[PDB]
Amino acid sequence: EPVAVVGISCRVPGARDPREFWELLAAGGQAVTDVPADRWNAGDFYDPDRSAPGRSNSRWGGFIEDVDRFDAAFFGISPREAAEMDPQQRLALELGWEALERAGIDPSSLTGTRTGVFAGAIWDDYATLKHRQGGAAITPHTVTGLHRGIIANRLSYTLGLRGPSMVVDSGQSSSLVAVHLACESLRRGESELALAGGVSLNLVPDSIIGASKFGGLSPDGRAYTFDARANGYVRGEGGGFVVLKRLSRAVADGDPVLAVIRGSAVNNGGAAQGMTTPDAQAQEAVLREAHERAGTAPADVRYVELHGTGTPVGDPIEAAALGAALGTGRPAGQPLLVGSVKTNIGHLEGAAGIAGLIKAVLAVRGRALPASLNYETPNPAIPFEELNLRVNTEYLPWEQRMVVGVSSFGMGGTNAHVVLEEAPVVPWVVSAKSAAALDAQIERLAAFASVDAGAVARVLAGGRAQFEHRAVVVGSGPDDLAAALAAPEGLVRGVASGVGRVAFVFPGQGTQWAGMGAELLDSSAVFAAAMAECEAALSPYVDWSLEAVVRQAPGAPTLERVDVVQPVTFAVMVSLARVWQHHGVTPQAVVGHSQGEIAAAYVAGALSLDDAARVVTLRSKSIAAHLAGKGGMLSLALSEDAVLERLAGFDGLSVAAVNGPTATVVSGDPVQIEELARACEADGVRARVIPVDYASHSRQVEIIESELAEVLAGLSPQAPRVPFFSTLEGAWITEPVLDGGYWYRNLRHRVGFAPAVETLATDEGFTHFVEVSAHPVLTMALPGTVTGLATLRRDNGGQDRLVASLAEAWANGLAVDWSPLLSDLPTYAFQTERHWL
Amino acid sequence: EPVAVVGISCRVPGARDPREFWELLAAGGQAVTDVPADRWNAGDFYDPDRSAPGRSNSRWGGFIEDVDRFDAAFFGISPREAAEMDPQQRLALELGWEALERAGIDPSSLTGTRTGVFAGAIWDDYATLKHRQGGAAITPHTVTGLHRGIIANRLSYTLGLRGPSMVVDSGQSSSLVAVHLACESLRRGESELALAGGVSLNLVPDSIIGASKFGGLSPDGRAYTFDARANGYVRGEGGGFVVLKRLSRAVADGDPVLAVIRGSAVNNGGAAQGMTTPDAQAQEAVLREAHERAGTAPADVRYVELHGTGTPVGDPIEAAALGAALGTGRPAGQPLLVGSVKTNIGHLEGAAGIAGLIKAVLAVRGRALPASLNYETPNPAIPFEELNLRVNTEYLPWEQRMVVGVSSFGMGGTNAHVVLEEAPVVPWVVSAKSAAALDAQIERLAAFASVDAGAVARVLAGGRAQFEHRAVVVGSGPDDLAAALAAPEGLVRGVASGVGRVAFVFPGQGTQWAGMGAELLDSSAVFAAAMAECEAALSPYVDWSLEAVVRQAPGAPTLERVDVVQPVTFAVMVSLARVWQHHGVTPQAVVGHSQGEIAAAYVAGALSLDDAARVVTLRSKSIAAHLAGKGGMLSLALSEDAVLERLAGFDGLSVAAVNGPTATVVSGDPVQIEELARACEADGVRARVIPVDYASHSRQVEIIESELAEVLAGLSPQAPRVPFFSTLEGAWITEPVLDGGYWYRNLRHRVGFAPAVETLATDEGFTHFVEVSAHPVLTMALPGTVTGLATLRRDNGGQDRLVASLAEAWANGLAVDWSPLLSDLPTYAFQTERHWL
């Protein structure tokens, strides 16, 4: 029975959104203005004589700013269709999206859901313009751009909603009827979720002429509702949506509940004293039926949001029905409070009742009742004391569940009444469909920050669409994030387009630093679990303790020797890959550089952790027992083509690695390494002698061959589960051929890393390379077109750096899921363009 | 859950009503024609080039005849408002009334009922015309004449319906959505009864331009639905209503059940391949949801009324969804039958689904499935055999409950599906709002008669409004009534206006005839009961038997003597008044003439039946024992003014009665009576010697005074419950002063009947005088302005005459209730006038 209002959006004459609407209401603000000069001239259609042909007694109204502006690209609408599209449809689209975002629901998540759309709409001023344009102005978009049911259906189409979708027209009750219909759709279980709302736009003078000939318009332009100056109403344009759910479903889904629709009723005036004369007894009947369905009694209903238009005929009849249904029955002298948002915003016509509903929701959320603005003397036609009714003349803090009624009456006598009871390091991730929209969405989130930083992060990560233009602000707490949203050039930014496949890169040398993973052992439970598993795997060989070396315990080795630094780097890389996969980034392939291949071979599933640990530990020990202190290595910023030439005259040298088409690595005898380095420094080139006492990938490695085959003989390699691009074979590895001989060849022969990345990038569609390392050493070597993503950096190796790397990956359109790292924040910054006939 | 369809009405291109619609369907008739020349020129807007500006590829459509004609007076609409009124509203009014009459419900009985109105409407061509007219054409009726919700609300207003009232727009599913909404309103108990329907009218070319630019229109003008020639649809205009009730309520109310809505569902296409592209999987989802709510399985659904438009994109998707939801699941080789009424009538747009629903109702009522007309070769895009679907190419008698589906899809992707199971002397009284309408309604009932005569009478008496122009045909049986509906100048006719108050007239002499009430003793149980009660009252005085005298038994008196004829006339008049009151005609007053006063005094409650019987019997016996054979009476067609003068020279005469201002009655000595009669015959006047051996109201009556006071002394008169106008005192009797002296004065003094009727007519507002008598003798004497109503006539005194008198009374707007005297008969003959902008 009870229906949660879980989200709201509105667009009303003085207010872009429900906070702005509440600010206007609490302030007692009046948004009735002159007619906009940009649509249609106020005075040219004005005449004080009600009988004057084709002219209105009213110069004033509630108007929405920028009804002609729409973000057609956001909804995938061509400018020609948007031009043909009724502004009511455009506004219902943007309102529907905003209202769902206000519920904290990503609207793109609703595709295929049984979500109903129930919209009230009754005016057709854009159709009036299309008609005035006459023949030949009709195009293939005219019919769908003007048909009013498309207001609901287009919203169902764009969001992919499969539930019922229809527009109701019962006049100025239509929105509240739509809410009633949505509520019954929820009670049947026909819908799991519903967008109930309505829209009206005063796009042409014809509607203010027809309303002035019908007669209801205030010659003063303000609705003195229930006041002795009740000279008529003023037209208003607006729209609103509520997102509605069963209260059980909303609480179970943890959705915010703004208010509960306890009950509602719809009836008609029937044989009133003329069709457009309101009927007090039919209004009583709606009040009573709705409150009965609400299971509610008068003493519980503290306020009614009037239909209250300030017409001299309508107000006494509404007051009489309220006193007969609610005022009497409440204790005498604690009256029912009443007011009308039409005293603030005018008569939003078809949207009128949703406006009253949203006002009431804001009143319960605010625990206060807004004033009615055009009220000095109680209308003498109304016996307010004898009804036990009081017009709420002042903002009243609302000190028993708070309960309000909302009434909406149509000119056709369709009455609706609804009873609302009151409700029973971190990333902020911002995304939009364009750079200008992204910048706007950042500026709005900064203004919002200008609060639970984590709850905001949950709403931004789970409750918002993930579009292609992405920024992330990463901060320790609310003000840290707020400051970092200033100077927004500092944010992580990126564009999620070409992603295709991801490769995990496992580097070799130069990635170590004292204390790598020490802060991460405390920060990340997955990393600590993986490092404990790696320590268990390594312990039958290393004699020391992995965690002791990482935490730099006093009695631990200090990463100075190879037989320590290589298994520690192996463990860190295995664990960091485990962390990446924990956060949604599984590798489509893995590629390793030198010893990194061992780590690759484990994350590919090729080698087992026992065997991977044995390989890394025993190869490192052989290096320390025979290769250490005997060789040297040298990085040169120069292509391997000229480098293989410069190796002439140095039989004790070789090319160790070709990391990119700009910088190679030679390895061999230390004296010849120094000779080549000095020769390069003679021609003015870049040369970086690598701090390594051994000479990997050289000839000297052959010395340890008779040792390696003795200690790696028992290996049992398996078929790689993840593809494994060997930079030794220079190609895919699809067979269990990673035995000890392979691990000797890897250490003895060149590293073909640039061939590997050129192959994976040009051929197999790999767009992102995630360097799973303690410090990036290879990402400055991939081709300019592939994305490179590091993990940890030197001395930046804690949770700060982990979330920075995950943010740079997810901004790169990677499958980052923010849940393992994790409230009225802004809705989408629509980049609205003018579209018109 | 199950909803009875209890009534239907439709107005479709070739058919005024559901019988005409079924005749078209069974005949395989096609009502698609050229565009009407009277609205807008076909060719001026035609161009074979779809791209041609402001022109349509289609010259053809389904059109309603006389969309501009409306019986505005019947609905109380001024010609100016009717002129402003959208023809869709006018047609929904007439359809709503007809549909309720088809249920056999008097629509005026529905005032204040929780009856919902649910209408689908989507086009606004009359608004298009009003808009084209520009400024200053807008009037106080433009807004209500154009607003689409008023289509529902106006019907709720005129019929006084208090239930919900709204128009739904979901495009070309809207009508069926309206039915779905009405069904859920019935299941909630929000409505006890609902009018669900829809309307669309092609009032302007703009809609056929916009539909040809959207592209769906058949360049051939015919919808080859599911056929290889599927070149598009053709537009159609129409309307339909179903009256819906809970099946339990309909069976309990004894309402006719035409079909049962077992279940329905509404969904949207959601993110279809474009908003206006149909989605086969969403259509499957509606089919499955609706059939689940129907508790139904494929083998039960024998036919589906397609949405089937003959567009080449729509038909394969609909066929695919049907085969996936119904065709497979039925046994292979006994396929699901399909067809489309759009092959007969084109696409009735917003009314489309109600048309399909009414067709299906007519199919279940008819136990046959109509053909689809534009179908020679199965569309090769559809794998009909692999779907197990067959297009019903021929009229198929439908030999397990019969079950059909109806599908309606909107261009906005709102899909609706509904499952219909098959259903689980006498007066004919004709009334209309005008003489021309009455004559038309008689001609229609004669054509209908051209059948259970009693069931027809029940439907005409209980199931039709009682308007002011009234006829009654009275006959022994169906053909007798049918013949008597020929030469309809013979009917009882009358006008129900001035009625004010009714007086029961109880006459004195000249009303007797041998055998009065003998046929009525057998025919009327109330009359026989009353006559038995009167016989019980009379028996302690009369020595004879009342029933024996009435049945003219052999040993009974033959009404020749006064002491018999007066108590028998008393009994007959008392009993006939009882009969009148049994049939709804209670007297506002009673007035008696001579001995008739005794009867009056009983029906007024003044005297009791024992005392009334004693008075009549003993006065009659005194008359026979002393007044009989001694006096004489004479009726003269002449005013009492000259008659009191002509009584000069005749001391043995007097004026006995002044019955009207034209004919008096003298009474006295027989010789002087004959002398006066001869004198009147000498001056050429009218003179009727009354066959009465006594001389009432004369001087001779004084002789019996000493007797009367001896036999009437014990009387206990009471206060008159019904007013009692004495024609002896010449005024009201409001005190218990009807003792024996009064009954002597009544017999001894004049009868002031003309004074009585002038007083009751001029003063107290009495308009109808019901002569409760065995033969009228006073009705030819009332003023020309009051209505006179007799009861029985001489030798016409059986049930024939009783129903003739009740018919003449009820045609005179008397409270006649036909129940104690008591099926697809015609609906109201609307006298439709052209109304337009």
Swiss-Prot record, chains A, B:
It comes from Streptomyces venezuelae. Residues 504-787 are annotated as: Acyltransferase 1. The active site is at S594. Residues 1-422 form the Ketosynthase family 3 (KS3) domain. This is Pikromycin polyketide synthase component PikAI. The lineage of its organism: Bacteria, Bacillati, Actinomycetota, Actinomycetes, Kitasatosporales. Homodimer. Pikromycin PKS consists of a combination of multimodular (PikAI and PikAII) and monomodular (PikAIII and PikAIV) polypeptides each coding for a functional synthase subunit which participates in 1 (monomodular) or 2 (multimodular) of the six FAS-like elongation steps required for formation of the polyketide. Module 1, 2, 3, 4, 5, and 6 participating in biosynthesis steps 1, 2, 3, 4, 5, and 6, respectively. Disruption phenotype: Cells lacking this gene are unable to produce methymycin, neomethymycin, narbomycin and pikromycin. Residues 3-837 are annotated as: Loading domain.
